Amino acid sequence: PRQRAIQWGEDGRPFHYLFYTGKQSYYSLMHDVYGMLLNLEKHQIGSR
Amino acid sequence: EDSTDFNDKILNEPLKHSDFFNVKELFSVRSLFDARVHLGHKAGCRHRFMEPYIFGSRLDHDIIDLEQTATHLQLALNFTAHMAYRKGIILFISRNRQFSYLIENMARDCGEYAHTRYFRGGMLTNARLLFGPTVRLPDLIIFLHTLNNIFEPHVAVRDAAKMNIPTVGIVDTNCNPCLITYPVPGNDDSPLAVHLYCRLFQTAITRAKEKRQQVEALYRLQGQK
Amino acid sequence: SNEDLPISMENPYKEPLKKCILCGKH
Amino acid sequence: NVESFASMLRHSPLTQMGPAKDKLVIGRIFHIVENDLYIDFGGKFHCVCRRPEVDGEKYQKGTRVRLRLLDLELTSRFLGATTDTTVLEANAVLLGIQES
Amino acid sequence: GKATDRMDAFRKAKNRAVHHLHYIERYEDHTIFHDISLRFKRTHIKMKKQPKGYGLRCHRAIITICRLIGIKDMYAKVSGSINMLS
Amino acid sequence: AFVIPKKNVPTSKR
Amino acid sequence: AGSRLETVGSIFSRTRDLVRAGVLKEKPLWFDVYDAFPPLREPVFQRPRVRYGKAKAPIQDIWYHEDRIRAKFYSVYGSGQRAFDLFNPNFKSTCQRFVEKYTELQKLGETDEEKLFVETGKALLAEGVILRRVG
Ligand code: FES
């Protein structure tokens, strides 16, 4: 099974700024997609 | 003896000055006033523990005393800088969904952390089970909004106290500051105010993190000679 | 002390108290 | 001498306004979802209005509009509550666009 | 500690207690500073500061807790309800 | 001192 | 170890006391910073009570003597067509314009409101104002 890589170094500081949400990957994605929508406002079958 | 030199030159030196990071220059009462930090909620929403900090009610709208905000804001910024200088993990907690993007960006820019999302039960009191036995918890938590989305104290305020983590908090007139280590009475709804706090805590952190580097370079020069 | 502090007044914006249509009529 | 906070309070455009009911103010549209126009008028809270059908296309993000303030904060206390229930917005009527 | 097995409740109670430690100031590390008269719910405790040698002349549960704190000379009378937890 | 039996809680090798 | 009794004392007192006792071997990272720059009020938990009987909140209402004039102007003339611009920190409205005139003419020594008001209303018309006295 694919496993998550160690999320902090020897000092103990996590590598991701969303570590403490518990879901850095999901909320990173959610943070990104939200920004992409935000920028768009600043600018203005067979698939599942 | 490296302990005496390292402790004195790094840890003990900054704690001997009143304003080692000159955070008092970052804000002024005119700057706070122009950001609408003095605007509180209506008098029917008031918390009785926030009364010491309320200058008055202007037509049933509590006006926060910016004179005490300045003295409190300096104390909160001073603590933040000293903790950023000391390599402390700073977590920014909020639930105001209008500013979750801003606060998450600001946390990444200063190399720190943000929890602007639904706070799952036990993140702090049950972290060695939710993360791993060797996880390091924050050394400082900055609340930019202290109420959750049902207008009640964020659970982390209490959990930070249980875990002995100091907290900085923006406390509006409807908030409960009894457990916050460094309350800063001010408006937490206006974008101007929230932008200002983010600008201030970003700078204080950034500036404190550089100076930690700009006092170990001196250690290098001193080490050679 | 200072002269720019709030003066202890009564509310000057107080609106006249609403009276019913039959107020003062026998 | 640095102006006292009290001094600033006296001469702020908000204090001299007095009661907010039926006061014409200028707001800036800072956020839009669908037809809901979120308009900051220069107070603690924003005011969500609706896009007027007359010139909907002209009410875009950043547009300055003329508002009719009714209340700075929509609050009320309800039966059995210990505090007021605030909506966290202001009440105002969107009249139109400011024209120079 | 709550569990279906005693030994599992001893563990939980024992380990959870060290995360909820008070610090009890002692006068001269043998007694209390003043006399304490408290009522917790329906339990009354009247505690008396005493000299040295007096010993712990107090309810068998208080002597136990006093031995764990470091108090060595005190008197207490428990009135009202005597619920161990109150 | 009453020694409580130490339970092998982490039986299951994770 | 630590004490999770967030309602007994503060994080400082609890930490301080556990260090003295020997439970906490290492002072936490924040301890020395707090000790050097403690907050104005120690963060101790308190339970909010209700005010029964005659207890009132000490918060007072912010009034200024200029408010009387503002009220009168709004009663006589009301909010003019002038749209308040709350963004400009130095914005002056026709109301405060009216007030300033009123206040300045009072410096001369006039102690009568009736005569003073009739003057002020027309002294602001000398400056060129849009007023409606009947509504
Ligand atoms: S309001 Fe009813 S008689 Fe006066």
Coordinates of C-alpha atoms in Angstrom, one line a residue, chain E residues 18-53:
Chain E
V18 CA -0.7 12.6 35.9
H19 CA -2.0 14.8 33.1
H20 CA -4.3 16.6 35.7
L21 CA -1.8 17.5 38.5
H22 CA -2.3 20.3 41.0
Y23 CA 0.4 22.0 42.9
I24 CA -0.5 22.2 46.6
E25 CA 1.6 24.9 48.4
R26 CA 2.6 23.7 51.8
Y27 CA 3.6 25.8 54.8
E28 CA 7.1 24.6 55.9
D29 CA 6.4 21.5 53.8
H30 CA 4.4 19.7 56.4
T31 CA 1.0 21.5 56.7
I32 CA -1.2 24.1 55.1
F33 CA -0.9 27.9 55.3
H34 CA -4.2 28.7 56.9
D35 CA -7.3 26.8 57.9
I36 CA -9.7 25.8 55.1
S37 CA -13.5 25.6 55.4
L38 CA -15.0 24.6 52.1
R39 CA -18.3 23.1 50.9
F40 CA -18.2 21.1 47.6
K41 CA -21.8 20.5 46.6
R42 CA -23.1 18.7 49.7
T43 CA -19.8 17.7 51.3
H44 CA -18.2 20.0 53.9
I45 CA -14.5 19.8 54.8
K46 CA -13.2 21.8 57.8
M47 CA -9.4 21.6 57.6
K48 CA -7.1 22.9 60.4
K49 CA -3.5 23.9 60.2
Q50 CA -1.6 22.2 63.1
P51 CA 2.0 22.2 64.4
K52 CA 4.5 19.4 63.9
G53 CA 4.0 15.9 65.4

